[PDB]
Design a binder for this molecule. Structure first.
Ligand SMILES: *[C@@H]1O[C@H](CO)[C@@H](O[C@@H]2O[C@H](CO)[C@@H](O)[C@H](O)[C@H]2NC(C)=O)[C@H](O)[C@H]1NC(C)=O
Ligand SMILES: *[C@@H]1O[C@H](CO)[C@@H](O[C@@H]2O[C@H](CO)[C@@H](O)[C@H](O)[C@H]2NC(C)=O)[C@H](O)[C@H]1NC(C)=O
Lengths: 55, 87, 260, 81
């Protein structure tokens, strides 16, 4: 159905698919300290549910 | 191929050429034997450095080490490397 | 250039633009500060970090690339010729015309000349572009003027030039707009930019057969004023950059494709 | 080439042009995958000799007019039988 972090849909974000994570988490720091992956944070900071299992 | 290119080149710059094959057939890398730390050249590159040669016309590579001692020209055919298996 | 050197407006309020970017200054000879990032930007950053030199980024105003019209050189080539700029970087091909007065380095991106079409021609010698006087008039190949291709088509098919006065003459994106509309079906331009732009598009537009039919196979280089010793140094470094697979990484972080 | 064809060895690692022509030339052999390194051929001589600059200009001169492409087509096109 999906793949790891290799697809161009994640390398180049698409308007159809939406990638979101839990805000204020360790993954936020992990994606906030990678040189090449910085742009994904640009997507992630755009819309990520500041939430929990509700999300 | 290369000799035809050589003809087409010499037809333009008033050339007279004497062509002779390499001594051993090895392309050429730096080679250092014990009691001699300097990696002396061996091959047609070493023959060119020795003084018997004046120009090399062969499908040579443009790796970093070769450009250290010898000035090259603009490449005329880009390519890569590949694997051959019986099939 | 669209994929290679990208210019962006500065940070929201600060002025020092977003990290992973280099400040650049467009001159008028309002020196507003913009921030530039891209392929050549990182290439130059690594080169300066490895040879210990400092630099500043300056753009040009007289034309995009520049040609020797009326025996006077405009553009980046002219700027380097007049010694108003010591180096030139970015989308600049190599050929005999420019090589007379300006030195060059070892190429690092293998370019070419290819034909973008819709989703019929298999070479310059094809009857279509060779003697276009048939019944069906296949019209308006792009070939953005005063660039790097007009001098090439100047002595490859001499009759193609005067037939080619009317075309899409706004930009590379205008050719895509006209192809999507249908006012034209022929486009001829550099291989690298066309491949990159055909990589990412809704659906996907099919270029011609591929790199197997590129004309005038050359490579993008770096211009510099003649007799500068600096050249030799960077030349060696460039080869080392092909050794560590640096080109593969710097391309995959700037090149991709949804169809290609 | 003879050894690996005789199944003494299994695969040969070599430049793309030579094998790309020979596979279509002899018989029954094809290469798999693509390049993992990219570079081209060139002319080499001793440092600081004008022949170097002049032939470097002449090579691009020939490339512009399709002489090299025409020669390559002539000498590799009669293959893939
Ligand atoms: C190639 O040269 C032509 C001729 O100079 C350029 O076209 C000129 O563009 C200016 C822009 O304001 C006009 O004022 C002139 O009237 C144009 N001249 C002609 C003859 O059309 C053209 O812009 C150049 N190409 C590029 C890419 O700059
Ligand atoms: C190299 O090619 C050039 C171009 O033909 C020539 O070199 C000199 O070029 C200038 C400018 O055209 C002439 O004024 C000189 O007379 C040329 N020198 C010679 C010796 O002819 C020449 O044909 C080639 N060789 C050298 C050494 O330059």
């Amino acid at each position: 159905r999906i793949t790891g972090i290799n697809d161009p849909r994640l390398r180049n974000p698409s308007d159809k698919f939406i990638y979101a994570t839990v805000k204020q988490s360790s993954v936020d720091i992990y994606f906030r300290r990678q040189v090449e992956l910085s742009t994904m944070y640009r997507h992630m900071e755009k819309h990520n549910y500041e939430s929990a299992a509700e999300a | 191929f290369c000799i035809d290119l050589l003809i087409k080149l010499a037809r333009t710059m008033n050339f007279t050429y004497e062509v002779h094959l390499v001594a051993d057939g090895k392309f050429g890398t730096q080679e250092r034997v014990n009691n001699s730390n300097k990696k002396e050249w061996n091959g047609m590159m070493g023959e060119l450095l020795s003084g018997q040669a004046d120009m090399i016309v062969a499908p040579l590579t443009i790796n970093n080490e070769r450009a250290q001692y010898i000035e090259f020209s603009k490449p005329f055919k880009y390519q890569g490397l590949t694997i051959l298996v019986k099939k | 250039e669209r994929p290679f050197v990208i210019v962006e407006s500065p940070d929201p309020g600060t002025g020092g633009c977003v990290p992973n970017t280099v400040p650049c200054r467009r001159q008028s000879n309002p020196y507003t500060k913009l921030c530039c990032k891209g392929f050549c930007i990182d290439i130059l950053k690594k080169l300066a970090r490895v040879v210990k030199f400092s630099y500043d980024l300056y753009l040009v105003t007289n034309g995009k690339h520049g040609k020797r019209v009326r025996g006077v050189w405009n553009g980046m080539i002219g700027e380097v010729y007049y010694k108003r700029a010591d180096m030139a970087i970015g989308s600049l091909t190599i050929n005999e015309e420019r090589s007379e007065i300006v030195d060059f380095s070892v190429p690092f991106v293998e370019t070419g000349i290819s034909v973008m079409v819709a989703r019929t021609v298999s070479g310059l010698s094809d009857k279509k572009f060779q003697r276009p006087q048939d019944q069906y008039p296949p019209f308006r190949f792009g070939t953005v003027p005063n660039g790097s291709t007009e001098r090439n088509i100047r002595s490859n098919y001499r009759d193609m030039h005067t037939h080619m006065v009317k075309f899409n003459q706004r930009s590379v994106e205008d050719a895509l707009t006209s192809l999507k509309m249908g006012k034209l079906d022929a486009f001829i331009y550099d291989a690298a930019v066309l491949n990159y732009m055909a990589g990412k598009d809704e659906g996907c537009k099919l270029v011609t057969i591929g790199s197997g039919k590129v004309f005038a196979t050359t490579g993008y280089g770096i211009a510099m004023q003649k007799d500068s010793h600096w050249k030799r140094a960077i030349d060696l470094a460039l080869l080392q950059f092909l050794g560590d697979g640096e080109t593969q990484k710097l391309e995959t972080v700037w090149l991709s494709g949804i169809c290609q | 080439i003879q050894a690996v064809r005789d199944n003494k060895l299994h695969a040969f690692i070599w430049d793309s042009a030579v094998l790309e022509f020979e596979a279509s030339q002899k018989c029954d052999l094809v290469t798999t995958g693509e390049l993992f390194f990219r570079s081209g051929f060139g002319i080499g001589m001793r440092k600081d000799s004008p022949w170097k600059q002049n032939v470097s200009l002449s090579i691009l001169k020939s490339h512009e007019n399709g002489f090299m492409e025409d020669l390559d087509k002539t000498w590799v096109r009669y293959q893939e039988c």
